[PDB]
Design a protein around this motif. Structure first.
Motif, mmCIF file in Angstrom:
data_model
loop_
_atom_site.group_PDB
_atom_site.id
_atom_site.type_symbol
_atom_site.label_atom_id
_atom_site.label_comp_id
_atom_site.label_asym_id
_atom_site.label_seq_id
_atom_site.Cartn_x
_atom_site.Cartn_y
_atom_site.Cartn_z
ATOM 1 N N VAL A 1 7.306 -1.565 6.829
ATOM 2 C CA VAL A 1 6.896 -1.045 5.410
ATOM 3 C C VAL A 1 6.348 0.245 5.454
ATOM 4 O O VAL A 1 6.137 1.174 4.557
ATOM 5 C CB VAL A 1 6.292 -2.292 4.564
ATOM 6 N N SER A 2 5.594 0.593 6.585
ATOM 7 C CA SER A 2 4.767 1.787 6.711
ATOM 8 C C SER A 2 5.952 2.844 6.807
ATOM 9 O O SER A 2 5.655 3.865 6.105
ATOM 10 C CB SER A 2 3.951 1.764 8.143
ATOM 11 N N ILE B 1 12.513 -2.236 0.149
ATOM 12 C CA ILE B 1 11.351 -2.308 0.713
ATOM 13 C C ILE B 1 10.874 -4.002 0.935
ATOM 14 O O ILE B 1 10.223 -4.245 2.139
ATOM 15 C CB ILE B 1 10.172 -1.506 -0.080
ATOM 16 N N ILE B 2 11.411 -4.769 -0.032
ATOM 17 C CA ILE B 2 11.130 -6.200 0.007
ATOM 18 C C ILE B 2 11.805 -6.694 1.600
ATOM 19 O O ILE B 2 11.204 -7.749 2.338
ATOM 20 C CB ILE B 2 11.120 -6.848 -1.159
ATOM 21 N N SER B 3 12.966 -6.376 1.612
ATOM 22 C CA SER B 3 13.956 -6.883 2.895
ATOM 23 C C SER B 3 13.363 -6.619 4.070
ATOM 24 O O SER B 3 13.331 -7.466 4.909
ATOM 25 C CB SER B 3 15.368 -6.276 2.666
ATOM 26 N N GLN B 4 12.958 -5.366 4.162
ATOM 27 C CA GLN B 4 12.197 -4.892 5.537
ATOM 28 C C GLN B 4 10.887 -5.348 5.788
ATOM 29 O O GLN B 4 10.625 -5.901 6.918
ATOM 30 C CB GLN B 4 12.040 -3.581 5.485
ATOM 31 N N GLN C 1 0.727 -1.009 -0.110
ATOM 32 C CA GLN C 1 0.068 0.000 0.140
ATOM 33 C C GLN C 1 0.744 1.203 -0.061
ATOM 34 O O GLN C 1 1.828 1.358 0.834
ATOM 35 C CB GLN C 1 -1.075 -0.181 1.198
ATOM 36 N N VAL C 2 0.667 2.199 -0.923
ATOM 37 C CA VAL C 2 1.200 3.361 -1.085
ATOM 38 C C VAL C 2 0.498 4.618 -1.415
ATOM 39 O O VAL C 2 -0.757 4.247 -1.664
ATOM 40 C CB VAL C 2 2.403 3.382 -2.168
ATOM 41 N N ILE D 1 6.845 5.912 3.357
ATOM 42 C CA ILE D 1 7.062 7.369 3.840
ATOM 43 C C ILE D 1 8.407 8.064 3.413
ATOM 44 O O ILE D 1 8.515 8.815 2.622
ATOM 45 C CB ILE D 1 7.069 7.598 5.404
ATOM 46 N N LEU D 2 9.338 7.140 3.442
ATOM 47 C CA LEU D 2 10.725 7.382 2.850
ATOM 48 C C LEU D 2 10.802 7.371 1.598
ATOM 49 O O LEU D 2 11.360 8.097 0.896
ATOM 50 C CB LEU D 2 11.703 6.241 3.443
ATOM 51 N N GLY D 3 9.946 6.371 0.805
ATOM 52 C CA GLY D 3 9.923 6.461 -0.558
ATOM 53 C C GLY D 3 9.377 7.734 -1.088
ATOM 54 O O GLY D 3 9.646 8.317 -2.147
#
Lengths: 101, 298, 249, 50, 301, 298, 298
Positions: free
Chosen positions: F276-277, F263-266, F225-226, F281-283
């Motif tokens: 991922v939340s 993002i996948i590793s986290q 979700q983005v 936000i970093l993205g």
């Protein structure tokens, strides 16, 4: 020795108002619609009087700058230091201020 | 007999033959004048709250009004000044700039363009040749200060001949220990630390006793006619900046540490008086180049 | 500067209500709190002037991450005007008011194990003046009432006779006590004596004079609020009234 | 201009007219910002907004 | 086998991490601008035979009108500038200047604390290492012009590797006698007196023949971003004045012969990009120090 | 047995725990919006011959007029965005952005801070583990391709197992030669080139012929979700810029080749739903960083 | 001591030295802007019923009114852009379009010729050399992501030297199994899956376990100053379109898979600074070519 503010916010080095976008602002007000979405003539009346105030300010700032210097030269150093302790605020009627400029 | 020479004096490459007429000299002087205004107007604008002085100066230099999105390169004048600098350094460099553009750029200001009304003192030490006997080892290090280290392993004293050229005005010799030095066919004076010599006097003979290595420090001064606007500090900065920007990268040229080192080498080579005439114009161009690029870095 | 200009207990307690905890944090690295250093004071001596850095100063200093450091940074803000560097405090705490930190249980800070003698030594009490010590005792009293350790406050006061004499007298839960207080707690203010622009020797003294001269400039600036000349221009919330009360209390 | 400690103030009507705005804008333009206080500044903004 | 390095490049001490924000840079820029007026006003006062221009300029710098007996030193601005200079040099410095003072002093003049407007050329020769074979002796002397004297006592010609680092832009090499030099794994050219090298090209190999010693003189040019008010002549004088007055006598710090050697040494270290930014601010502050102390002399002999 | 795991899935460092509240999320969304206008006003001003559109956009972003002889960094908003990004990457990175500054900057535009109103597809393939018997070697290469090279050199069938985790939605397998793969205790199907798999189905067991090495290419898709204004192209370029600029230089942190790998590793680490939340936000912040830096290079 | 090098870094051919002036760069920028109007208008005309927006756009682009019966080819602008693209790629191209035509075309729109106001990031990983010891086989494939597979047959551990061209900014190395990597004369750290490297640091040493192959995946980021209208998605598409259309067919010329490899390969040549400037101008011209050809399929 001492320092005093130059009257009417005019920089003597540039011989103009401190705001460099003043002419652009006056033109923006003239075309702007105010108090109503349809024109009420507020922009034309205000821009006309604001331009007159700026022209009178730029033409007559040298005399007031000299006048403030002459008044300051009449005060001894001891008396000037005492007046630094006092403070106050002057109330001017809106009609007097606009008529002054 | 062994011969030792200064490293910066060998093989001075030919200099350019273009942009040496009166119109081009005016353009270089005009470039210096307008570049000076750019730096001063830059400081004036930064000090105050208005950028009007900078816009006025940049408009004269670049023939256009500065814009926020565009990079302040310098305009047509910046392009012309860079290309003329490359032409001066080597005769192999092309002469890209047409004369019509140079004349147009030279009309911005009213300057004389005379490059020989003043003088400047240059400190490079020319050691043309040091001739030494068979058992003697001689090494020359440095240009601004020449250290000549001499050692003789023979049984007796050795006579070493110094030749400083005919261009330098005065040469001062200092030694670690007092030593003997005299001109040709003259008696040897008593050992002294410091010697002041006129290079035109003739070859100088120095006595070298056995043991105790003797090192001689040499400092020279030469006078070269330059325009009144010449500033040695600004010329040296332009030389390093132009060298770092690749303005002197071209096949079959010699590279020098300083403009001091560059102009002395050309003076001592054959056809030197006409060589230093072009080098002086290059110096004023570099002085303008240093000022313009500091105000407008790319 | 604004905190150091508060004279009454009512004005200081009102200021701690409005001011969030982030003003107590500095966000600047500073240096180590206790260190012997050589400083330059050229107006008096050519030789470098020895001094010792302390937590009560107008400059940022490194502070411990625990609740002890957070309490110390609050006190240093009140008595010196500048706090400490405590990295990575949650946003919930930073938006809370200073008074809420000292006098409320809603925040997650646990202060029950606080020792007043240790804190008084770390925030050097032998170096503070009388007004600074009075401000510190206000902070200690607020913490004691929130924690229920009012006896520990009294034992600490009995161990130090001069502190007991000058201890402010108020009840942290009753507003009537605050109004009746006549204590003066203004570190900076308009000076009756002649104040010059010369420098001072000690770090604390030179830093304090910077705040003193800054307040005089702030007094004559347009940001200063003149009650006798512009009282009708003030918002009703910020106007001086006799019935003004702190939240709760 | 001579003394920095002095200040300039105004009082406008409950219903400002075009003169009140003209007076307000003349002060903010040709009077020192050190003479106009923060509270007077908000009042001058309010009368222009009205 | 043997490794030789430049003396000024060894162990650069850490620099300060305080007063590096936007407001602090404005304070340094204001100090330099007002110090320049102080020098100019003093010259004008001498010409016009009146102390009014100097009294007027000193009032802006120090916020006070001096008395006759009291020595003039600059007041709070001089005190803040001197202590901030110490904080930049080393981490161990106290850094005891409040933020209120910095903000008030930065408001005196309308100038911007931009430390990346222009560039400057720093002529200090970085020789990170010179690796030599067992029977050869290498000595490195000098910083502005490095003279590398190498003697080959061995039986055959030796190869000596030069590492000039990666920060410098142009390095010019001159020798007492023509010598051979080329990049790693490349043909050796004919013997020449002068070489122009890019330090990023790679380690360079020089051939040392058996016999008389060969001395190679080195000169480098490095370009570092500096404010448009930067003046190298004034910075060097301020660096010497600060060193003589004893502002740099902090424990566990390195002492350098020039600001040229200081800024290059910090550049040739880990996190050197961040160190140079602090050193540039120190340079302008030193420039302010020199102008202010020359106009207000305190020490007498 | 032998264990082979993907490189980018190993040891995901703890992520930042600051600037994740509603107020901070609003500021990041405002930064993305105002940076987009800067790049749009930049193009319009270039075509329109006037700099009026750029001045207005820069004034909103930096709270000051654009002035010549200035670096044109971006004002306090650029500083706040840079320091906010640094705090996101690591929990050890200091948080040095005042809360009052965040609220002031977030008041420039009216946007919602919702980070769950849309979705994006990430193509990094999580090969969690590949278990192999003796005498056979398996190697995993790549993050988007995931070519896996296996050789048997043994009489019996290898009969190895695959694990793609429980997070990825679909995983597509292709091979150089046809092969047969089953779901643990399932009947082996006909050997085919391709396969479509749901990783939630279970460990997938594949047999390896003795003859020739087999290479399997795996392509996966994951849904995260983005926010609506999430552009994967801009985020990838912003991630590369941040690493070059040195924003991710905290010690004891792990580095990743691209944002999808990060993002996948986290996601696959323990407590991945909360990680991922912060990553999204970093993205979004990285998207603003790229647009603003390209408009105002430094 | 075997040497292994990347395929695309070998023999970068010279580029054209023509059409690199301010007026020429203005023409390329004007072409891109007017191509954007053409394709956008075609989308608008397809959406609506009328075809006037396409008619006006084509009138500006081709200087003639479109006609139903006559074929639409792009007019003078199409011929000049096609010719100028030929000249950029190689120095052997005829470069036939006149300068007067270039100046007249550039007068259509008021657009700056700036090519350095922004930046772009390219992913071609440069591996100039992988010096390999004896009994050590090294294979290096790929350009966007480099797969380096190395085998050591002997019992002794082998050290391999990696040189990354000192032009790239950051390189990230990912291995199938953890490996040890360090600089010259630095201590060996513990085996790790991923390393973040700076090519400027110097050659790197990798140790080889003898049991199994170790393969390293390499990704690199390099920033190059590009115009603010740059679009890597459109540039890459145009690069393929020009190659298929035979625009790059010239004797003694090397060919590259993508524009990323083209610009990176020349940046590693001896005259990298001068060649990249021309290559950037080609990229913007390629962007205009793709946009115009997709609007006009002829």
């Amino acid at each position: 020795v001492g320092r005093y503010y130059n009257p009417f916010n005019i920089d003597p080095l540039t011989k103009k108002h401190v705001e460099d976008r003043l002419e652009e602002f006056i033109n923006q007000v003239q075309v702007g619609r105010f108090r109503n979405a349809s024109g009420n003539a507020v922009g034309t009346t205000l821009a006309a009087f604001l331009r007159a105030c700026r022209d009178k300010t730029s033409a007559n700032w040298r005399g007031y700058s000299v006048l403030v210097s002459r008044y300051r030269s009449l005060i001894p150093n001891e008396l000037f230091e005492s007046l630094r302790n006092i403070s106050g605020e002057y109330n001017i009627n809106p009609q007097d201020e606009h008529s002054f400029f | 007999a062994n011969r030792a020479t200064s490293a910066f004096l060998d093989n001075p490459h030919p200099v350019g033959v273009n942009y040496v007429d009166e119109g081009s000299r005016q353009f270089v002087a005009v470039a210096e004048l307008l570049a000076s205004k750019l730096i001063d107007s830059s400081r004036e604008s930064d000090e105050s709250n208005s950028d009007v002085p900078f816009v006025q100066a940049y408009s004269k230099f670049a023939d256009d009004n500065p814009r926020h999105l565009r990079v302040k390169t310098g305009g047509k004048m910046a392009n012309a000044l860079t290309n003329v600098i490359r032409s001066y350094y080597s005769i192999n460099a092309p002469a890209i700039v047409p004369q019509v553009e140079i004349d147009r750029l030279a009309s911005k200001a009213t300057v004389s363009g005379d490059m020989y009304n003043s003088y400047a003192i240059f400190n490079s030490v020319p050691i043309v040749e040091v001739l030494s006997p068979a058992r003697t080892t001689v090494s020359i290090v440095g240009s601004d200060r020449a250290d000549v280290t001499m050692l003789n392993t023979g049984a007796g004293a050795a006579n070493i001949t110094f030749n400083f050229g005919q261009i330098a005005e005065t040469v001062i010799l200092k030694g670690s220990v007092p030593f003997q030095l005299a001109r040709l066919n003259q008696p040897m004076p008593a050992a002294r630390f410091t010697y002041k010599l006129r290079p035109l006097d003739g070859p100088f003979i120095v006595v070298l006793p056995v043991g105790n290595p003797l090192v001689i420090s040499a400092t020279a001064a030469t006078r070269i006619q330059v325009p009144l606007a010449f500033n040695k500090a600004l010329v040296e900065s332009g030389f390093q900046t132009a060298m770092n920007d690749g303005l002197f990268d071209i096949q079959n040229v010699n590279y020098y540490s300083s403009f001091d080192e560059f102009i002395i080498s050309q003076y001592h080579a054959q056809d030197g008086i006409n060589r230093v005439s072009t080098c002086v114009i290059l110096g004023l161009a570099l002085q303008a180049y240093d000022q313009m690029r500091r105000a407008l870095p790319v | 500067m604004d905190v150091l200009s508060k004279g009454s207990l009512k004005e200081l307690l009102a200021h701690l209500e409005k001011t969030p905890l982030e003003e107590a944090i500095s966000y600047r690295i500073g240096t180590v709190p206790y260190q012997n250093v050589l400083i330059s004071r050229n107006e008096y001596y050519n030789q470098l002037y020895p001094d010792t850095t302390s937590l009560i100063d107008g400059v940022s200093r490194e502070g411990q991450r625990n609740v002890n450091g957070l309490i110390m940074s609050i006190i240093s803000y009140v008595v010196s005007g500048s706090g400490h560097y405590i990295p990575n405090i949650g946003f919930m705490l930073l938006r809370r008011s200073i008074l809420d930190i000292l006098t409320k249980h809603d925040t997650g800070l646990v202060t029950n194990n606080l020792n007043y003698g240790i804190i008084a030594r770390n925030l050097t009490v032998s170096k503070m003046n009388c007004e600074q010590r009075k401000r510190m005792l206000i902070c200690f009293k607020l913490l004691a009432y929130k924690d229920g350790n009012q006896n520990d406050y009294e034992i600490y006061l009995n161990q130090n006779i001069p502190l007991k004499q000058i201890a402010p007298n108020f009840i942290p839960g009753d507003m009537r006590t605050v109004i009746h207080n006549q204590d003066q707690l203004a570190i900076v203010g308009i000076p009756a004596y002649r104040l010059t622009q010369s420098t001072e020797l000690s770090i604390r003294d030179d830093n304090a004079k910077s705040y003193k001269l800054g307040y005089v400039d702030w007094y004559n600036s347009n940001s200063f609020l003149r009650e006798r000349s512009e009282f009708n221009l003030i918002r009703l919330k910020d106007r001086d009234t006799k019935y003004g009360k702190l939240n709760g209390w | 201009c001579m003394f920095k400690q002095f200040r300039i103030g105004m009082t406008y009507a409950l219903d400002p007219n075009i003169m009140d705005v003209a007076a307000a804008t003349c002060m903010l333009l040709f009077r020192p910002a050190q003479s106009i206080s923060d509270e007077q500044y908000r009042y001058c903004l309010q009368t222009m907004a009205v």
